[PDB]
């Protein structure tokens with residue numbers, strides 16, 4: 001069980017002004033720290049945030065959070081469930097900012113909601129340094145779905161923060177799960193007039209203005225004012241990052257298919273699905289630490305059965321261990337694992 005701590009800095013809040021927080025399980029014999037970012041879509045204007053507050057309120061408020069959470073998958077402390085990092089210090093950061101972890105804006109006379117995702121991460125890191133993170137050797141910032149995109153937006157800022165605070169020896173790394181999306185041609189098209197018809201490029205462009213969203217500085221300098229939405233797409237922001245980042249992405253991600261307006265498959269949709277797999281594989285060709293199986297799924301690293309899927313005979317926990325060794329090619333210990341077969345579930349280890 002990981003135990004809830006609400007932030008001591010009361011100015012760093014969830015959407016409705018309640019304090020943000022983190023769940024922690026310490027491992028006093030370890031200098032490894034895992035900080036995991038929760039996912040769960042986003043909201044980008046007053047009307048769709050109001051709807052989210054009625055039926056997805058745990059993603060906008062700490063008012064109803066439980067005192068404890070059980071660690072699962074990569075957050076499990078049992079080697080049977082977590083062969084990779086079972087002895088690490090474990091941190092789960094709830095997603096209560098609805099901003100893909102990018103926002104830096106308080107609730108005020110002109111803002112009904114606070115969007116503070118980028119500042120929540122910074123304050124969690126700060127308060128953990130007084131609870132043992134000062135003695136760390138490695139801090140892995142991990143996350144799933146919107147939290148995986150959050151890793152890409154924030155990992156270099158965590159590295160800069162620790163350097164400026166006087167801890168240049170802590171090695172900061174990223175693990176982005178199911179947060180590597182394509183701004184591709186959709187299978188059917190709708191102009192952006194409301195929540196469900198607005199493609200991610202248009203929704204994120206509006207969201208950044210609504211959230212006062214923040215992107216990594218080198219990527220911001222490339223795309224410049226008005227074009228910061230480009231940095232929410234992994235294949236565009238990843239080449240600007242300095243920290244080591246491992247990319248986990250299903251080739252036929254269900255959330256990608258949803259935003260592509262895809263749900264007996266005839267030729268047009270067969271060609272569309274096969275081309276998506278090819279394009280995703282192409283964007284990962286020069287990513288040296290990656291795990292990309294040919295399955296229709298979404299998220300993996302905090303699932304209890306995350307040990308089951310394999311690419312070319314190698315599991316995800318093994319690939320992460322091989323990554324650790326490479327950051328001290330390795331015989332029998334690969335770090336780049338991308339399926340080549342062209343249809344969902346052509347890999348027999350795909351989750352059922």
Ligand SMILES: c1cc2c(cc1CNC[C@H]1CCCO1)OCO2
Nearest residue numbers: 015016017018053061063112113
């Ligand atoms: C009031 C103002 C709001 C809001 C929601 C509220 C309702 N009260 C929420 C409090 C009770 C428990 C912790 O926060 O959403 C944005 O502005």
Ligand SMILES: c1cc2c(cc1CNC[C@H]1CCCO1)OCO2
Nearest residue numbers: 041146149181200232233255258
């Ligand atoms: C998240 C973050 C993104 C993104 C796309 C997503 C996916 N969320 C939208 C889906 C969730 C469930 C139904 O619509 O584009 C780049 O940043």
Ligand SMILES: *[C@@H]1O[C@H](CO)[C@@H](O)[C@H](O)[C@H]1NC(C)=O
Nearest residue numbers: 009010011012119122123126
């Ligand atoms: C609390 O957080 C805000 C927002 O980042 C920051 O400006 C302020 O300095 C923080 N206060 C303390 C005491 O850390």
